[PDB]
């Protein structure tokens, strides 16, 4: 072949760049917000007398 034996496969390509972006880049804030709501619901039920 006469060149490097490595192959690059990006997931979401970046304009004029090698490394792509995974799905975790866009969902950073959404996961944190969702986690806060779930913990709040459990705390309301868990700490309540029953």
């Amino acid at each position: 072949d006469g060149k490097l034996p490595f192959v690059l496969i990006p997931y979401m390509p970046v304009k004029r760049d090698m490394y792509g972006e995974p799905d975790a880049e866009l969902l950073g804030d959404n996961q944190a917000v969702l986690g806060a709501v779930m913990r709040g619901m459990i705390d309301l039920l868990g700490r309540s007398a029953n």
Binding site: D29, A32, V33, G35, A36, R39, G40
Partner: protein
Amino acid sequence: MYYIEELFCRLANGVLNNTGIVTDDRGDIEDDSKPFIIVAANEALTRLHGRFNMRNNNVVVEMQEGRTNYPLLAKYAVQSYDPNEVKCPFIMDLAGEKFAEDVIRILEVYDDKGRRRPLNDRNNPCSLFTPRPNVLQNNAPKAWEVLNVMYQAKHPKLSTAEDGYNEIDIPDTLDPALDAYIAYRYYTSLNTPESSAKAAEYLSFYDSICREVVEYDLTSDTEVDTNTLFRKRGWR
């Protein structure tokens, strides 16, 4: 900020002008009845410092091994203590005014390491306890542990005796409340129906002034701060 002498002159030329407890020239109170005003004055100042968080003071307590209860009394301070009775005082007031024994309610406790020690937390193993309002209890005194206690402090006790405390430090807007309360005790002590009706009016006036202060918030009693739970809960 005025001395105790001006209080007698203000009362003589104020609410108590008509009564016979003042001198002929209405310039001072009789020496035979000065302690009567002092008892009322001490009572009035305690009530004001309870309703309003005017004064906040902090003390330094040095832990001593073998002792779990640390009363906040004057005789345990480094100043004005008996070396014959207590061998080593644990309350340090080396600088500034002496410890006046004016503890009402403990607010927060911080140690020398810079952290916050939980107070009256029964489920917390390392929390302090207060079996009495003016007594601080530690269940594990260490070698060099030193505690700082922030508490709501009342005004120091006034006394006409020599080398006593004879200065009044209250906000000037509460002066009418002080005079009304003192007059209330004087008139209600006469056991006279004419004076009893007058005494009730002064008590209502004292309460009216206090609620006026709360309504307009002249003492800055309220306190708010930036919310920190937003980051603690991870809302982001």
